Each structure stands twice: as structure tokens, then as C-alpha cells.
């Protein structure tokens, strides 16, 4: 049996705190967005012809347009306001682990893995150093991975051929910490 | 841009399944249990800072149901094209034997929002401690969802996340085992 799906979305986009806010109301039939309200536009617009009726109609209703035009304060800035403590300011520190991906004995190419996990928010800088010098090449990163539970994780690998007494360091910079986290690995 | 809060709802037929939720930067703030008619906060500690009256969501779902009926017909009844999910299984952190960890089954880029997920332990289904999220919106208008399995790392067993979706020829089993 065929399925038909309807979605409605109200997106509050915040720039420089609530300095700049933009609200978007989108109506999507199945996977096609048909009509949307963009605070920066001030009125509805049909995204696809299936939404033209709605755009024509809702723009006619003028109480509805005034209501929307004001949602930027009544809805957007209000909810940011209410949520700010537990969302905008959430701050979980990353667990940093360093380990070679394989146990293939010295002087053989190996991938050194810097595992950074359980952090919030998303932004973070993970750097690799060899004997104090920063290593920019041969870095393979999984990118940021959202775990769906208000925490992130990322794995940043360094392609190495460890020689004896080489000291490798993963350095992590994240808003939840004053000074960069570092973990060393001794070949 | 700094942040984005997203109020997302959907109504699906013929399933007659609906959803109401909030999203902050990719993460679910809360969703309304339509059946129990109650607000469920993603992190318990969120409900100590804000309040949401569930009956409103329920009203919203009704307009959604209605509007869907109007649109389906308006579209000359064009049904939704299934888009099977991408599935990934991972853990919360680096596995260490005899160190409680969590297996995350990440289901992404699918539509419609209906999926059946089973955790199998040495081929037998596992339910102890499992949890999952509701359907998280995506900018392309497809959905995301997570399933979780708390587990104790061992070399004695293999793991699979079994996903069933209309856009899949057969159930997709993604495997995980401790190295």
C-alpha cells in the first residue's frame, strides 16, 4: 500500500546570540517542500506548484501573516530564552584516548588513532604532533559524529611508521576546557 | 549561524502515525507521546528547566492529519517514494574487554518514517536495556533515528543491528564484534 506523508517545520535560526534571528515554516508533501514562510520575506511563497494554492490563500489571511512576522520574538527568541541554560550553554568534556590501530611491530606503517568522545558541543580541534612538531599530513578523520544523546565523538588517525623513542601527541581544543587536552603515545 | 531550533511534525498514511518534536542543533529536546499524551524530554534534566503542554501538540497533529488528506488528493494521489536507510553500528567509546559500553545503531537518510529494528546477540534478539530515539528530521526531508544497546564487551559473541524498511529488498543486518 502507498504511503503519503506530510511534514511541517518551524526553524528558528540564530546569529550572534539572538541578535539576528530568522524563522522558516516549511510544508513538505512526501519529500517535496511545497510552500514556506521565511521571516526575511514576510510572506508565504509556493516552493512548488502544489503549494501555490496555500501561498495564495495564506497570504490572503492577514492575521496569520502578522502572527508569523512576530514569531521571531514571541516564539523564536522566547524558546531560545527558555532553553539557553541546558542547550546553548551545555558543556561536556571529551574523553581522549590514543592507541595504534594494529599491533604490527616497529618500523612498519601504522595508524595512530586519537579517539575523542562524549563531548558537547560539536566544535573541537584535534591536532597531531611528533616530537613536539605538528603533523598535518597523513591525517585521516571520521569527522564529527553525533551520537543522538547530546554527546559527540570523533576519531583522528595519523599515518605513522614509528621508530624507537618517538613521542606522538594528540592535542584537543574544546570549549569545555581552559587548556588543551593532550595524550602522548610512546613508540 | 550559531544555533537552530526546529519544531518538526509529521503525519503519515495509511499508518496514521504522527510526530511532534523539538530539535536543537541535531539533538532532540523532547517529543510528545501521542498515545500517552505526554511530553517526553530527551534528557530528564531538561524538564527541570522548561515545561510544555502536550495537548497542544495533539492539536497540531490533527491539522497535520487534515492537511495531509487535502494534499494527497491535491497531488492526484502521488504516494511517497521509499528511500531505504543507511545503517551504521558503533560504540559510545573505545571498547575494552569487561568495560560496559554502548552499541549505537545509526539509521539515516530514509523515508517514510517507519522502520523495524532488532538487536541480535549471537543471532538471538536482545532487549535488555535497549532504547532508541524518535524520527529526527533532516534538511533533505528524510529522517534519522538511533537505537542503543548497553553491553559488556567480550570475545565470545558477535552483534548485529537488524533493520527492516519498505525501501529495502530484504532486512539489513549490520554486524559488530570485539576485536
Amino acid at each position: 500500500r502507498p504511503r503519503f506523508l506530510w511534514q511541517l517545520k518551524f526553524e528558528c535560526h540564530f546569529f550572534n546570540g539572538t541578535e539576528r534571528v530568522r524563522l522558516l515554516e516549511r510544508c513538505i508533501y512526501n519529500q517535496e517542500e511545497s510552500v514556506r514562510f521565511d521571516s526575511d520575506v514576510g510572506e508565504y511563497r509556493a516552493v512548488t506548484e502544489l503549494g501555490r494554492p496555500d501561498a495564495e490563500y495564506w497570504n490572503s489571511q492577514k492575521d496569520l501573516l502578522e502572527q508569523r512576522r512576530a514569531a521571531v520574538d514571541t516564539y523564536c527568541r522566547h524558546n531560545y530564552g527558555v532553553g539557553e541554560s541546558f542547550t546553548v550553554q551545555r558543556r561536556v568534556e571529551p574523553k581522549v584516548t590514543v592507541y595504534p590501530s594494529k599491533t604490527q611491530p616497529l618500523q612498519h606503517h601504522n595508524l595512530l588513532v586519537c579517539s575523542v568522545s562524549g563531548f558537547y558541543p560539536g566544535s573541537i580541534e584535534v591536532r597531531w604532533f611528533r616530537n613536539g612538531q605538528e603533523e598535518k599530513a597523513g591525517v585521516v578523520s571520521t569527522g564529527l559524529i553525533q551520537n543522538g544523546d547530546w554527546t559527540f565523538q570523533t576519531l583522528v588517525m595519523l599515518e605513522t611508521v614509528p621508530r624507537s623513542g618517538e613521542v606522538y601527541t594528540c592535542q584537543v581544543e574544546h570549549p569545555s576546557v581552559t587548556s588543551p587536552l593532550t595524550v602522548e603515545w610512546r613508540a | 549561524e550559531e544555533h537552530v531550533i526546529i519544531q518538526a511534525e509529521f503525519y503519515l498514511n495509511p499508518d496514521q502515525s504522527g510526530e511532534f518534536m523539538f530539535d536543537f542543533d541535531g539533538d532532540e529536546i523532547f517529543h510528545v507521546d501521542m498515545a500517552k499524551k505526554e511530553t517526553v524530554w530527551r534528557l530528564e534534566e531538561f524538564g527541570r528547566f522548561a515545561s510544555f503542554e502536550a495537548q497542544g501538540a495533539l492539536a497540531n497533529i490533527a491539522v497535520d492529519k487534515a492537511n495531509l488528506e487535502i494534499m494527497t488528493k491535491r497531488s492526484n494521489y502521488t504516494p511517497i517514494t521509499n528511500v531505504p536507510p543507511e545503517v551504521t553500528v558503533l560504540t559510545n567509546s573505545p571498547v575494552e574487554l569487561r568495560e560496559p559500553n554502548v552499541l549505537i545503531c545509526f539509521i539515516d537518510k530514509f523515508t517514510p518514517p517507519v522502520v523495524n529494528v532488532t538487536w541480535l546477540r549471537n543471532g538471538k534478539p536482545v532487549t535488555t536495556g535497549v532504547s532508541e530515539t524518535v524520527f529526527l528530521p533532516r534538511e533533505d526531508h528524510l529522517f534519522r533515528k538511533f537505537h542503543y544497546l548497553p553491553f559488556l564487551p567480550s570475545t565470545e559473541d558477535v552483534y548485529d543491528c537488524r533493520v527492516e524498511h519498505w525501501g529495502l529488498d530484504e532486512p539489513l543486518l549490520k554486524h559488530w564484534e570485539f576485536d
Partner: peptide, 14 residues
Amino acid sequence: GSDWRFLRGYHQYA
């Protein structure tokens, strides 16, 4: 301060 607000959708042109 408490109340998490939400918007409601308007009725489609029938």
C-alpha cells in the same frame, strides 16, 4: 522561564 512555545499550522487551501 518555563513555557516552551510552539507554532501551529494553518489550514490548507481545500
